[PDB]
Amino acid sequence: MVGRRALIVLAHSERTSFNYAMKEAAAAALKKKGWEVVESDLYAMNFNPIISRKDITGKLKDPANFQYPAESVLAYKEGHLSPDIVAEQKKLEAADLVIFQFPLQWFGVPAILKGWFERVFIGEFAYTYAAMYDKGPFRSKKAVLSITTGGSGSMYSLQGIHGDMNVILWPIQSGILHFCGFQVLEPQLTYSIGHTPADARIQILEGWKKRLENIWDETPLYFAPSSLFDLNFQAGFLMKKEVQDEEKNKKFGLSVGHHLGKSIPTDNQIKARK
Amino acid sequence: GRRALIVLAHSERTSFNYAMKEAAAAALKKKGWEVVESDLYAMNFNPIISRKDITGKLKDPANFQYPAESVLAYKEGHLSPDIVAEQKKLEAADLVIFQFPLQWFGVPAILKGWFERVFIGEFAYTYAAMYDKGPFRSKKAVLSITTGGSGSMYSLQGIHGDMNVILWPIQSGILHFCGFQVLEPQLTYSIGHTPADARIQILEGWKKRLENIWDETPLYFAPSSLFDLNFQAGFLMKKEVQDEEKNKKFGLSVGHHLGKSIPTDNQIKAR
Ligand SMILES: Cc1cc2nc3c(=O)[nH]c(=O)nc-3n(C[C@H](O)[C@H](O)[C@H](O)COP(=O)(O)OP(=O)(O)OC[C@H]3O[C@@H](n4cnc5c(N)ncnc54)[C@H](O)[C@@H]3O)c2cc1C
Ligand SMILES: Cc1cc2nc3c(=O)[nH]c(=O)nc-3n(C[C@H](O)[C@H](O)[C@H](O)COP(=O)(O)OP(=O)(O)OC[C@H]3O[C@@H](n4cnc5c(N)ncnc54)[C@H](O)[C@@H]3O)c2cc1C
Ligand SMILES: NC(=O)c1ccc[n+]([C@@H]2O[C@H](COP(=O)([O-])OP(=O)(O)OC[C@H]3O[C@@H](n4cnc5c(N)ncnc54)[C@H](O)[C@@H]3O)[C@@H](O)[C@H]2O)c1
Numbered sequence A: 001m002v003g004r005r006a007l008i009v010l011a012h013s014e015r016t017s018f019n020y021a022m023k024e025a026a027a028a029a030l031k032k033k034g035w036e037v038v039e040s041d042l043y044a045m046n047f048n049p050i051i052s053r054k055d056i057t058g059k060l061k062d063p064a065n066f067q068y069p070a071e072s073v074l075a076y077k078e079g080h081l082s083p084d085i086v087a088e089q090k091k092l093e094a095a096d097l098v099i100f101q102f103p104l105q106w107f108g109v110p111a112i113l114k115g116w117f118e119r120v121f122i123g124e125f126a127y128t129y130a131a132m133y134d135k136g137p138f139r140s141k142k143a144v145l146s147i148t149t150g151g152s153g154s155m156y157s158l159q160g161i162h163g164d165m166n167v168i169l170w171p172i173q174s175g176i177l178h179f180c181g182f183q184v185l186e187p188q189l190t191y192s193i194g195h196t197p198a199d200a201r202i203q204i205l206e207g208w209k210k211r212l213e214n215i216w217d218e219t220p221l222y223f224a225p226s227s228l229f230d231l232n233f234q235a236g237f238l239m240k241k242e243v244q245d246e247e248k249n250k251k252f253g254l255s256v257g258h259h260l261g262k263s264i265p266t267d268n269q270i271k272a273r274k
Numbered sequence B: 001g002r003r004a005l006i007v008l009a010h011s012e013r014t015s016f017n018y019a020m021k022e023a024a025a026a027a028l029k030k031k032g033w034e035v036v037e038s039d040l041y042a043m044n045f046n047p048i049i050s051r052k053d054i055t056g057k058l059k060d061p062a063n064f065q066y067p068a069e070s071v072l073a074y075k076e077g078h079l080s081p082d083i084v085a086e087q088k089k090l091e092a093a094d095l096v097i098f099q100f101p102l103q104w105f106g107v108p109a110i111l112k113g114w115f116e117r118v119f120i121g122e123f124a125y126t127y128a129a130m131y132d133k134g135p136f137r138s139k140k141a142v143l144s145i146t147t148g149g150s151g152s153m154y155s156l157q158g159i160h161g162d163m164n165v166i167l168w169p170i171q172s173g174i175l176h177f178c179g180f181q182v183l184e185p186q187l188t189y190s191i192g193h194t195p196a197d198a199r200i201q202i203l204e205g206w207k208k209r210l211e212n213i214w215d216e217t218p219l220y221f222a223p224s225s226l227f228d229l230n231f232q233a234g235f236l237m238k239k240e241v242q243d244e245e246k247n248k249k250f251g252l253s254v255g256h257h258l259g260k261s262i263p264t265d266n267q268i269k270a271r
Helices: A018-032 A066-078 A083-094 A112-120 A165-180 A198-212 A241-247 B014-028 B066-075 B081-092 B109-118 B162-180 B197-209 B239-244
Strands: A003-010 A037-043 A099-102 A142-146 A189-190 B003-008 B034-039 B095-100 B142-145 B185-186
Touching: A003 A018, A003 A083, A003 A112, A018 A037, A018 A142, A018 A198, A037 A083, A083 A112, A112 B109, A142 A165, A165 A189, A198 B014, B003 B014, B003 B081, B014 B034, B014 B095, B014 B142, B014 B197, B034 B081, B081 B109, B095 B239, B142 B162
Parallel strands: A003 A037, A003 A099, A099 A142, A142 A189, B003 B034, B003 B095, B095 B142, B142 B185
Antiparallel strands: none
């Protein structure tokens, strides 16, 4: 897709890493199809992942009782956010596709990437309470996670010691990415990369590249639409009574998080359905 | 005389999180606990893993791998001293309380980093000893979490979805993986809209709970003995155990749902 912009966020310190190789592969593949490609190599930027007062360069509303959510929003609108935050915000605004490339660390994102989310995804910019989930600011955009693990895929199967990978991805894909409005595409999961032989590693790279050629035409993952819920305080943001009645006699729930005490649809967070 | 470690991840001394830390310390000292703190913001704790975490000679600096190198450094004792100081607090401690606000459906970056730099292989886990067999099986941990959203938003029918799913990666994947018995989480919902008189009752309730915290029953995780713990079997549930669960309506846990119903409040209440 020529005219389209991609942001690649990388969270690995080493240029010798397979994560770095997957980043470079993606950039190459995408440029070849005529994408503009911007990067946030968080280690190379020495990105500061800790929220603090110093994120606001102007005057605090209330420095005696500092609240990061309230103050960060004011700073966004009056335009006195720390410039490092703003630079990242501009990359996001510009971008149509966001690829996150990172190793799984303690069942989640690396601290440096977690911090990126905390400092960059500010209220009013990346979400409001009016516009949550499918109605959020980034509904035009598509995001994908590309994850490498130490553990093997068997360990993350339904019968694996670690348990279902779908549950592990839910807080990131739903609670961070979709909450801001992103359409989330199937994750690229690269299991036990340390114990994958060299010829296979090369096929994985070739497979990533091949996938990115038609990435924009992919169907996204299923999350419950916001229209299934009463979006106000008096109703408690609960699923509507009509929708609850329509789901009563279904065997499967809507998603991992909206399991509703029933079975979770197979690979809700890993494969799309039409 | 038992020992408690309180890990706090909030920058502000005016915060309810700070108030809950102080409450816990007070309550616990009164019952004759020794109480150590890791106030991560106040310590200016460095949450980013890097080469600088190893003060000695790298095995292989051309192809640096944090897991392999960090373990060597632990064994030969050339870990950065800030890591080691935290490691000593953990070793000493019987009860570990994590006090933090929920940020983006998870722990703050600074606390996540603490886990990454402090929970090193051989110290906090092996491979031989995962989950209930892990090094910290003598210890108990509890999460104490504040949210902006209300508990309804995190119910089965809430816009955000089941809180049990949100806690699973932390309680199972981090805490229990290293061996901790995990106690029922202390969840303080919609703290932003709770007036001062109520906040004080919440603090009094926390304090009251901590008087008998050690006698509490922990959360249920699938025992490791249900699995074949070796590489050739792929760490899968044993065939006999799979056959015995076939007919059950409910799964074992949030992560081990097995395509069936999740036991109610698996990550929030003990059986
Ligand atoms: C703090 C921490 C916590 C962790 N927690 C977890 C956890 O909870 N769960 C889990 O499953 N894992 C966990 N891990 C493991 C982690 O996910 C893996 O180390 C990571 O995914 C490996 O990716 P890498 O890119 O760093 O691998 P590397 O070891 O850097 O790369 C793997 C192999 O690919 C080779 N390679 C490099 N470039 C190329 C190329 N261009 N072509 C071909 N081969 C190439 C390398 O030389 C090497 O042989 C954790 C690790 C850390 C540090
Ligand atoms: C980056 C980021 C991401 C977030 N993501 C999420 C998310 O995913 N989900 C979610 O639900 N929320 C989220 N939030 C909101 C966040 O969880 C809340 O703002 C937080 O839990 C508030 O708790 P606090 O301790 O900071 O309270 P504060 O607002 O700082 O404190 C509450 C009040 O209690 C008062 N107080 C202190 N001590 C006492 C005392 N002893 N007696 C009486 N009153 C006292 C204080 O003065 C203050 O006025 C996020 C916030 C941030 C910054
Ligand atoms: N960052 C996030 O991802 C995220 C997500 C969800 C919520 N939040 C936070 O939640 C805030 C708002 O939610 P909250 O839980 O703090 O508000 P709340 O539910 O405590 O307040 C609701 C309002 O209605 C009143 N009210 C109380 N009981 C009621 C009842 N039974 N029926 C009707 N009205 C009642 C309250 O006094 C208050 O004025 C947001 O502004 C934000 O700070 C953040």
